[PDB]
Design a protein around this ligand. Structure first.
Ligand code: G3C
Lengths: 338, 233, 228, 283, 58
């Protein structure tokens, strides 16, 4: 009774793809071909946060738009004061291999995950001034690739065991576990409403997961290479994925399609980080070719370059108000571009 | 987080005393220590200040080289050496914690305190409207504070602090800078400042509001104190 | 402004601590323990001492070595291997005595795949062969033969430069060096492969790593100064 | 011949300035080149560039009309700073050789031993010990310590600021400025050659089982020796001899020393793929 | 076996993904452009702005 199951699975998959094809009638590029402003944007650095020991893999902006967190290869979290290029905190990690860090929206906690299979929760604002590990999140059998904060006590994680997982900081237990990936999942993009989130995997198929119901609402194929990064559009209906095939794939959760692809002949390296502006007008993408090309989501093309890094651009983030964009690379330097 | 203070007592004029402030239950290695003393019948006063790594050390204008301040991180202790104790050098000394990372809560926690009985310009003027007023419960209470300069720094940080310490006990912290309320105190408190005149507003009142308030600035560093408004029930 | 100057002083203290651990990190050579599950890697870390990542530490002649073993991983796709680029060398640990698919072929495939990995271009492998004893009670005993399903190993004999230090038996040495050059083919086909022979437990193994590292960086410097 | 010497000497000065300025701006700007050995190379480039923009033009004029037209106080100032910067360049060469040694003899302890602190110590030593000795030899009248009539006769030989040296002072400046750093470089680099040859032979024998060192060492030692050794040997044999040496030969030996200052950027910066790649990225 | 169970689970998951809303793609593009242009007037501190508008002030 397995052959019939495969038959039904592929039948419904192809009827899904036919439903998508019927739903899709026109592309987004030709919709917006009429207008073409902000064709060339200039954002000089003016801010370079130096002090990280080793290669930086992840960073996250604070909701206050002034405070930042970044993780380094040696196992060091640095809380930065972005406005004045200051170190706010220095957290030495138990595991010397971290590949994701996140900053709580409330500003009290920092999530930290890597090869240790754990997303460690550090409390920035304890009764004492010492950042302390308020809660280790264990239960993943693969390397933890991205754990973003849902709430002050509720968090979402993405690990190397093809399984994303919701967790409660109060109990530390994996709540409403959900897996739908065949290849391991490397990044998740959280919606502003904190009720949905989209995660990308080596399967080259993004998955939209509902927080409350806790199982896959929607799947998005379309990437010719491994997915490395994902950001969710501020409007709440779209999201962009950065990948090893040098293509930024912008899908929409509505209508189950790909809105656009952002690629060029010059770029052949992988895309390691992706973020959107405050209005989502610019798609800022990190590349393995020492460069952070600023693409224009609306203009269907690259509008600007954030070059100035001496190694692989591994992480970048646009602050909540969109005032500036931080960008971490492997040269141990994280530079803010305004 | 506990602070235990030791030393003080009857001292002959011109004497030297080693006041101690030990930290128990927490580590002060990243904490700046401020030696704010309480006058027995007047407002609080600051004399000395040491940084977390002892990089920057400041003293009051009245006591610049007379006092000596040291911190021992391995022992988690603060030592205050005082020489040539005059009859005026009597106060209710307190050791104050203050960490200065962005968004922190300066002057959040105060020690138990010690008493010390002794035998016989550029400084900003920090003034409050009144000193005492009878207050009925429930109705909103407004306290006015004034400074001889504009506390709104170019970065936008108006360095003002309220403490509202009850008589004969460790001062607390109510609000720091602008419209920033410590999670320990109730949300009923609020602060409003035009830039030179400032107002502390209290929506509702209970038994905890009884006591004297205090107003501090931090733009420059003389740490001038206000007169102190007393609320009695 | 004193709050902001204190922001700077806290920044300076943090940067001083960061410089201290910068010196610590510079004075340390990171290693990546690698191998299969049936191998003796765990035994080795015990001699080193005497979640997902195991941060084993050991010091030899005032040289620190962080040998990192991946305990709980998917073992289907090695994407985290990109995170190891600064490692001095990656420890490849394989059980030589596979008896009579067979795990020698799987180990060879893993070694070839991790040799041809571009994330490890400037990375030298120091390969360890364990189960010298378990090979001894198999090849010398003769209960299981290698010629049963290997067409090769019959036209191959001990090389003239082979050094049989244990001297247990010519057959044992022949099989062991067949394993050695079977592994080294891939490496011979910027980086080096250092084959070593050992049993499950050995103190000299730790010293071996040091010696291997003392070559790698040296050459890495020789190539850096156009000396090699 | 005057015009030919002027043209060649202009070429020397311009090459020194362009090479040293290129090295300075490359090391100071790129964060990919902020390594301690690159700090040694940058200090070398600064020393040689200051040499080019201070001591070589007035010495150029002196070699041009075979006389000094700049004053006696400026004469002593030049001579002292010309000794200071030449000895500083040689000391930088010796310390770069030492750094390259510790990268090969102790590769497992290279980045720990040769941190920024030790390299800054080497830079300060190279900028200070030659300074103190040169100024003590020139201004404090330690140049000769005696033979004042012989000093005057040496002045009367050309009248254009030709430095005089006693036998003891000559041997002292041979040992400090040249022989100690030169022998350190020679022994260090012979050991480096032996090690590199042994690890080249090992690789070759492994490769034939499956079936650069000479160039670099020869370049470094050949340039350093052919540019300094004749100058120092002649300059120390003249006090031992009756000072029977052509002034033109002496002057071209000074110009050799300046020629080592010229090639110093090209041996330690432009000879290596990393710095060449950084320069290509700049260009 | 586990293979039949996982195949059935995948079939159920994707078939209940089938009955999901699919708005017109042009409508989604129009909504995206409307969101972009509505916040384009503000688009805090990304358009050509004076140096005093920057809180970095460098
Ligand atoms: O009248 C003069 C003659 C020669 C010189 C220079 C020549 N150029 C190399 C620098 C140098 C000189 C002389 C030394 O004795 C010495 O040890 C050094 Cl390093 C200066 C003034």
């Amino acid at each position: 009774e397995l052959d019939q199951l495969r038959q039904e699975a592929e039948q419904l998959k192809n009827q899904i793809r036919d439903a998508r094809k019927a739903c899709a009638d026109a592309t987004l590029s030709q919709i917006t071909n009429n207008i073409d402003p902000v064709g060339r944007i200039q954002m000089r650095t003016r801010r370079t946060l130096r002090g990280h020991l080793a290669k930086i893999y992840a960073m996250h902006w604070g909701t206050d738009s002034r405070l930042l967190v970044s993780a380094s290869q040696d196992g060091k979290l640095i809380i930065w004061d972005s406005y004045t290029t200051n170190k706010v905190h220095a957290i030495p990690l138990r595991s010397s291999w971290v590949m994701t860090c996140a900053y709580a929206p409330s500003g009290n906690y920092v999530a930290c995950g890597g090869l240790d299979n754990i997303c460690s929760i550090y409390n920035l604002k304890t009764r004492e001034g010492n950042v302390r590990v308020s809660r280790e999140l264990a239960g993943h059998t693969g390397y933890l690739s991205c754990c973003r904060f849902l709430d002050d006590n509720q968090i979402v994680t993405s690990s190397g065991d093809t399984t994303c997982a919701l967790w409660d900081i109060e109990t530390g237990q994996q709540t409403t576990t959900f897996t739908g990936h065949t290849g391991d999942v490397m990044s998740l993009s959280l919606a502003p409403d904190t009720r949905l989130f989209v995660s990308g995997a080596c399967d080259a198929s993004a998955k939209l997961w509902d927080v409350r119901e806790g199982m896959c609402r929607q799947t998005f194929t379309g990437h010719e290479s491994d997915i490395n990064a994902i950001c969710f559009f501020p409007n709440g209906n779209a999201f962009a994925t950065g990948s090893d095939d040098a293509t930024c794939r912008l899908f929409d959760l509505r209508a189950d399609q790909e809105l656009m692809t952002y690629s060029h002949d010059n770029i052949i390296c992988g895309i390691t980080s992706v973020s959107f502006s405050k209005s989502g007008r610019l798609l800022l993408a990190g590349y393995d070719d020492f460069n952070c090309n600023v693409w224009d989501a609306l203009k269907a093309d690259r509008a600007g370059v954030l070059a100035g890094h001496d190694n692989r651009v591994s992480c970048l983030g646009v602050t909540d108000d969109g005032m500036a964009v931080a960008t971490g690379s492997w040269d141990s330097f994280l530079k803010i571009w305004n | 987080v506990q602070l235990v203070e030791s030393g003080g007592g009857l001292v002959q004029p011109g004497g030297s005393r080693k006041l101690s402030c030990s930290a128990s239950g927490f580590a002060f290695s990243s904490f700046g220590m401020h030696w704010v003393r309480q006058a027995p019948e007047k407002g609080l006063e600051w004399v000395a200040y040491i940084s977390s790594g002892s990089g920057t050390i400041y003293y009051a204008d009245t006591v610049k080289g007379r006092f000596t301040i040291s911190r021992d991180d391995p022992k988690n202790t603060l030592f205050l050496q005082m020489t040539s104790l005059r009859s005026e050098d009597t106060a209710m000394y307190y050791c104050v914690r203050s960490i200065y990372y962005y968004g922190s809560s300066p002057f959040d926690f105060w020690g138990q305190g010690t008493t010390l009985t002794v035998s016989s310009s550029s400084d900003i003027v920090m003034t409050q409207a009144t000193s005492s007023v009878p207050v009925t419960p429930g109705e909103s209470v407004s306290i006015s504070c004034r400074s001889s300069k504009s506390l709104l720094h170019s970065n936008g940080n108006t360095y003002l602090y309220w403490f509202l310490q009850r008589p004969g006990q460790s001062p607390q912290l109510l609000i720091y800078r602008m419209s920033n309320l410590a999670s320990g105190v109730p949300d009923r408190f609020s602060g409003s400042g035009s830039g030179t005149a400032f107002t502390l507003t209290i929506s509702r009142l209970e038994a905890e509001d009884v006591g004297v308030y205090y107003c501090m600035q931090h733009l420059e560093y003389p740490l001038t104190f206000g007169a102190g408004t007393k609320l009695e029930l | 402004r004193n709050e902001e100057k204190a922001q700077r002083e806290a920044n300076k203290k943090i940067e001083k601590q960061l410089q201290k651990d910068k010196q610590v990190y510079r004075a340390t050579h990171r290693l990546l323990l690698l191998g299969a599950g049936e191998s003796g890697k765990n035994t080795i870390v015990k001699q080193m001492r005497i979640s997902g990542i195991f941060e084993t530490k050991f010091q030899v002649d005032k040289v620190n070595f962080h040998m990192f073993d991946v305990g709980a991983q998917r073992d289907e796709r090695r994407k985290w291997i990109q995170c190891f680029n600064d490692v001095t060398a990656i420890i490849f640990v394989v059980a030589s005595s596979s008896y009579n698919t067979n795990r020698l072929q799987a180990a060879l495939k893993l070694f070839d795949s991790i040799w041809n990995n571009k994330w490890l271009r400037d990375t030298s492998v120091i390969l360890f062969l364990n189960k010298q004893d378990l090979l001894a009670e198999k090849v010398l005993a003769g209960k299981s033969k290698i010629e049963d399903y290997f067409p090769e190993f019959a036209r191959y004999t001990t090389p003239e430069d082979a050094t049989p230090e244990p001297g247990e038996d010519p057959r044992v040495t022949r099989a062991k060096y067949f394993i050695r050059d079977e592994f080294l083919r891939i490496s011979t086909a910027r980086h080096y492969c250092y084959p070593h022979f050992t049993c499950s437990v050995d103190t000299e193994n730790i010293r071996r790593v040091f010696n291997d590292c003392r070559d790698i960086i040296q050459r890495m410097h020789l190539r850096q100064y156009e000396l090699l | 011949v005057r015009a030919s010497l002027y043209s060649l000497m202009v070429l020397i000065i311009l090459t020194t300035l362009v090479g040293n300025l290129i090295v300075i701006v490359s090391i100071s700007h790129f964060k990919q080149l902020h390594t301690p050995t690159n700090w040694l190379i940058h200090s070398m480039a600064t020393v040689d560039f200051l040499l080019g923009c201070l001591v070589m033009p007035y010495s150029m004029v002196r070699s041009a009309e075979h006389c000094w037209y700049f004053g006696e106080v400026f004469c002593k100032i030049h001579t002292s700073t010309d000794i200071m910067l030449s000895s500083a360049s040689i000391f930088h060469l010796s310390f770069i050789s030492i750094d390259r040694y510790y990268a090969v003899c102790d590769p497992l302890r290279y980045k720990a031993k040769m941190n920024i602190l030790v390299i800054c110590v080497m830079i300060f030593i190279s900028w200070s010990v030659p300074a103190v000795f040169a100024f003590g030899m020139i201004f404090l009248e330690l140049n000769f310590k005696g033979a004042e009539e012989i000093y005057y006769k040496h002045v009367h030989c050309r009248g254009g600021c030709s430095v005089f040296f006693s036998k003891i002072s000559g041997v002292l400046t041979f040992m400090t400025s040249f022989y100690i750093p030169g022998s350190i470089m020679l022994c260090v680099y012979y050991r480096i050659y032996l090690i590199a040859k042994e690890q080249a032979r090992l690789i070759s024998d492994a490769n034939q089982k499956l079936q650069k060192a000479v160039k670099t060492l020869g370049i470094v030692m050949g340039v350093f020796l052919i540019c300094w050794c004749p100058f120092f040997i002649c300059t120390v044999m003249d006090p031992f001899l009756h000072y029977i040496i052509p002034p033109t030969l002496n002057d071209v030996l000074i110009w050799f020393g300046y020629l080592n200052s010229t090639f110093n950027p090209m041996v330690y910066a432009f000879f290596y793929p990393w710095f060449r790649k950084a320069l290509k990225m700049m260009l | 076996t586990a293979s039949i169970a996982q195949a059935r689970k995948l079939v159920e998951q994707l078939k209940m993904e089938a009955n999901i809303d699919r708005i017109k793609v042009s409508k989604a593009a129009a909504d995206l452009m409307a969101y972009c242009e509505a916040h384009a007037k503000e688009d805090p501190l990304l358009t050509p702005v004076p140096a005093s508008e920057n809180p970095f002030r460098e």
